[PDB]
Write a protein that binds this ligand. Structure first.
Ligand SMILES: Cc1cn([C@H]2C[C@H](O)[C@@H](COP(=O)(O)OP(=O)(O)OP(=O)(O)O)O2)c(=O)[nH]c1=O
Ligand SMILES: [Ca+2]
Ligand SMILES: [Ca+2]
Ligand SMILES: [Ca+2]
Ligand SMILES: [Ca+2]
Ligand SMILES: [Ca+2]
Length: 902
DNA sequence: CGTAATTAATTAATTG
DNA sequence: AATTAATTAATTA
């Protein structure tokens, strides 16, 4: 097989590499890598190396990496550019793997682990590690085994062995319900003392050294705790054994508070799953505890136990260990669904970077671009210092707040990356500037043509047309991968809807789910067989379809993120190819494109309807337009339609056969106007929205910019079995909004768009009536807890203290003096509740750590003094008032003449 | 060390 | 309560 790296480090003058060799075995080598850097040389000197602008370079080959670094510094003292890859391990990888890497994941040791630490005096700080480690569960992907290291004897209690028999039993049998599919995969090792547990863990680590190290909060807790505990007991050199090269870096981090240190293990790639989740999930959660995320992702019940965690080992060691193991499994279950490890490996190997560098799109793009240029013997420019400067972004249209009955939306495919490709925007393709006219002059096609030679953006930039820049070339490659996966995602989604339809009439039999590839639209024979399936088979298939869709979604959305991050990197000072002329050429072109096509769409529809000056485009943001279709529907008459799906078909057909051709013509003209390299402005139909035929639903509404709701029947080719609410920006979409309120507001909106005014009034009346029975967590607001210290004056709110910070300060006073009560962690999330006047907490609100029950000491008082009236007005009535006034509806039935009868 | 546009909630100070 | 400036949090794209 083809070889691939596992890990790479620079340690002084050595590269330490772990790799899989041609036979599929893991090896390590230390290489005295001799790096090369480059300097400009005279034009009349023969060389094969050129910088990105075509200037000739001479190669400087150094005896070691230290000399290369010292040369860089001397070139600074002289005042001359030092060209080439200054990150020597990336040059090493490029030299050693001068080909497209084909990796085999089954050869990569992916370790998932978690530790338990009993602590009587509060949270066990990793940098102190003063408490014994009493449990470690370490899953190894190669063995497919959970290795359980259990401490039977501790200063905090002596316990009996964990029983795998009880662990397997149902909770109703007094067991721990450890999933049966992992029971056989557990290797249980009990220990008489902590020293031997840790010594054996380290020997184990030595034999099964993680390549990818993951788990939940392992970067901030497990890794620092284990390192420091071993350091405290055995000395530093023994702790360093967690690195295969015996080198570590301790950093008492310095950017915004937090002096609790993170440990870098050389020769290991740490991908903390919390960080993977935060970057790649496209969620913002109210809480990031494993219980909360597990429940959200997998629909598994919370891990339940009596008493505080500080007494769990002592009171119920059996459950203590069982839950440690389950915790480890849950991360694996989340990854089976989300596939962030797969994504990280794909991205890392494609770019040829340390896998952990996937968190940095700048590093990722620096390496991709470097490798691409190196292929042609081109030399990358030196990184430079830049002051941070603001620059202009997208255009957002001010919508008229209103109900909108029939809406067809259109959307530009992968806009900013397509602009890069269309215009040919790259550091080395800059050809010059032209004299800009005001933007609206380009929008209206009255400004003079920017250039008859070069490809142009309305910000004034000109680009060469003779050849594609490295940025367009490389962004194109990742875009095409993205497109392939989006195609799989959409097919799985369409397939999901076929299954839902068939679920309306399940057959009465014992059968099995069909063995199908869900990434492809079901064939006619599959569709026929589905119509004969049982509910159980159909449900399992739906689950599988939806799992395929999620897999597709991860692969596609994160490749979209990567390409959009290349645009973003052009606007970040730490990017080697940072250039505000390029970033601004992209955004300015976007503003023109949107407004240009708004004008064209209005012109086209005014023609086809025989009107003049009618505004058909009601809204747009960045790259999307929302077109009112009321007149289109009214031209045929609602009476002609058999059902909802009939007008949805009509609009779908009108969009595809009439509007899209016109839209294409308009963008082709714009391309010629800007003299661009390639027409890549593709604006396809996104949404078809409207009320159910014959209903009193309003269909949709806008309250303002980035705040709207639509009742959608079809989304980019997916015809829904049930209409789906597309709600953007409103309180239902915000993690800060109480869960019960999100739900209730979503139902108000549903009733508005699908059923009408009366249905909404009926529901509101009921919600207001029953509101007070709702669980306190369900009606708590959520916020991030930043800068607590700044606003803390003696334990009371300082000037300008934010509402949620006040809540925290109240909480601190309430629990002050208690070492064991949950502390609010700076930068973490908190639940927030209003408090009625005259309460014992001495303020108007209380906040506590999110995802948790409030400590039992003050729970009864919070529940007693919760201000339900303030909660209702602030979180529910206020936004609903906003929705309904924008929609011209009343959430409460107003008086009428009819009130004088019966 | 990916980006900008934009919203709502909030505090402080004002709005004769 | 409204409006205005400044902060904060969180979205849409
Ligand atoms: C979501 C997102 C968008 N944008 C910018 C760049 C996008 O091209 C532009 C439009 O956003 P989107 O319409 O959300 O996405 P897209 O057009 O790039 O890709 P597609 O529609 O095919 O899924 O907004 C970012 O810069 N960063 C982001 O994270
Ligand atoms: Ca735990
Ligand atoms: Ca788009
Ligand atoms: Ca689309
Ligand atoms: Ca059937
Ligand atoms: Ca869009």
């Amino acid at each position: 097989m083809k070889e691939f790296y596992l890990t790479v480090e620079q340690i002084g003058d050595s590269i330490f590499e772990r790799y899989i060799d041609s036979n599929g075995r893991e090896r390590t080598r230390e290489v005295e890598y001799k790096p090369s850097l480059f300097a400009h040389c005279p034009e009349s000197q023969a060389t094969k190396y050129f910088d990105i602008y075509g200037k000739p370079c001479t190669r400087k080959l150094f005896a070691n990496m230290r000399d290369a670094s010292q040369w860089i510094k001397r070139m600074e003292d002289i005042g001359l550019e030092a060209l080439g890859m200054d990150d020597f391990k990336l040059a090493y990888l490029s030299d050693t793997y001068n080909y497209e890497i084909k990796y085999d994941h089954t050869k990569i040791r992916v370790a998932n682990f978690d530790i338990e630490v009993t602590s009587p005096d509060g949270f066990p700080e990793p940098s102190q590690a003063k408490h014994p480690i009493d449990a470690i569960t370490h899953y190894d992907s190669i063995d497919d085994r959970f290795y359980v290291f259990d401490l039977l004897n501790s200063p905090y209690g002596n316990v009996e062995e964990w029983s795998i028999e009880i662990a397997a039993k149902l909770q109703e049998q007094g067991g721990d319900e450890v999933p049966s599919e992992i029971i056989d995969k557990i290797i249980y090792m009990p220990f008489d003392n902590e020293k031997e547990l840790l010594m054996e863990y380290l020997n184990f680590w030595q034999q099964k050294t993680p390549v990818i190290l993951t788990g939940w909060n392992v970067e901030s807790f497990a890794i620092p705790y284990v390192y420091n505990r071993i350091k405290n007991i055995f000395g530093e050199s023994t702790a360093k054994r967690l690195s295969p090269h015996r080198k570590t870096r301790v950093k008492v981090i310095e950017n915004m508070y937090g002096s609790r240190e993170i440990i870098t293990l050389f020769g290991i790639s740490v991908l903390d799953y919390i960080d993977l989740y935060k970057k790649f999930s496209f969620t913002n959660q109210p809480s990031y505890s494993l219980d909360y995320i597990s429940e959200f992702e997998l629909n598994v019940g919370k891990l339940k136990y009596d008493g505080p965690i500080s007494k769990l080992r002592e009171s119920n060691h059996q459950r203590y260990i069982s839950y440690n193991i389950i915790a480890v499994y849950r991360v694996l279950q989340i990854d089976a669904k989300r596939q962030f490890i797969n994504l990280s490996l794909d991205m890392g190997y494609y770019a040829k970077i340390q896998i952990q560098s996937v968190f940095s799109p700048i590093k990722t793009w620096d390496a991709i671009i470097f490798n691409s240029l190196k292929e042609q013997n081109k030399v990358i420019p030196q990184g430079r210092s830049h002051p941070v400067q603001p620059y202009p972004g997208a255009f957002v249209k001010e919508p008229i707040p209103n109900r909108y009955k029939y809406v067809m939306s259109f959307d530009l495919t992968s806009l900013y990356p397509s602009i890069i490709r269309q215009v040919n925007i790259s550091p080395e393709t800059i050809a010059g500037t032209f004299k800009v006219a005001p933007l609206h002059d380009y929008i209206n096609a009255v400004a003079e043509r920017p250039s008859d030679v070069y490809s142009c953006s309305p910000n004034g930039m000109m680009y060469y047309k003779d050849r594609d820049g490295v940025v367009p070339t490389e962004i194109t490659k990742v875009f095409n991968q993205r497109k392939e996966h989006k195609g799989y995602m959409l097919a799985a989604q369409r397939n999901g809807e076929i299954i839902k339809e068939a679920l309306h009439n399940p057959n009465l039999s014992v059968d099995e789910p069909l063995d199908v590839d869900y990434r492809f639209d079901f064939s006619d024979e599959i569709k026929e067989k589905i119509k004969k399936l049982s509910a159980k088979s159909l449900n399992e298939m739906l689950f599988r379809a939806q799992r395929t869709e999620v897999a597709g979604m991860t692969a596609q959305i994160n490749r979209k993120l990567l390409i959009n991050s290349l645009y973003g990197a052009l606007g970040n000072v730490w990017f080697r190819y940072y250039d505000l002329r390029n970033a601004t050429a992209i955004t300015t072109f976007g503003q023109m494109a949107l407004q240009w096509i708004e004008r064209k769409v209005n012109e086209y529809l005014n023609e086809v309807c025989g009107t003049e000056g009618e505004a058909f485009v009601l809204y747009g943001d960045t790259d999307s337009i929302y077109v009112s279709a009321d007149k289109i529907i009214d031209k045929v008459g609602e009476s002609k339609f058999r059902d909802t799906n009939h007008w949805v078909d009509f609009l779908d057909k009108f969009a595809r056969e009439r509007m899209e051709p016109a839209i294409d013509r308009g963008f082709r003209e714009m391309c010629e106007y800007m003299n661009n390299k390639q027409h890549l402005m593709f604006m396809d139909r996104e949404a078809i929205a409207g009320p159910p035929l014959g209903s009193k639903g309003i269909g949709g509404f806008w309250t303002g910019k980035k705040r709207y709701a639509l009742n959608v029947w079809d989304m980019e080719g997916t015809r829904y079995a049930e209409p789906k609410l597309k709600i953007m920006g409103l309180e239902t979409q915000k993690s800060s909004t109480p869960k019960a309120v999100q739900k209730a507001l979503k139902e108000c909106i549903r009733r508005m768009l699908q059923e009408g005014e009366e249905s909404l009034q009926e529901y509101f009346k009921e919600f207001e009536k029953e509101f007070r029975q709702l669980n306190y967590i369900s009606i708590a607001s959520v916020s991030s807890a930043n800068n607590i210290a700044k606003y803390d004056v003696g334990g009371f709110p300082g000037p300008k203290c934010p509402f949620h910070i006040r809540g925290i300060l109240t909480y601190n006073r309430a629990i002050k003096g208690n070492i064991d009560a949950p502390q609010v962690v700076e930068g973490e999330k908190v639940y927030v509740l209003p408090l009625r006047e005259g309460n014992p907490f001495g303020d108007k609100c209380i906040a506590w750590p999110s995802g948790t029950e409030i400590t039992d000491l003050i729970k009864d008082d919070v529940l007693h003094w919760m201000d339900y009236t303030v909660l209702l007005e602030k979180t529910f009535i206020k936004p609903l008032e906003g929705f309904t006034s924008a929609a011209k509806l009343d959430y409460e039935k107003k008086a009428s003449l009819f009130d004088m009868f019966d």
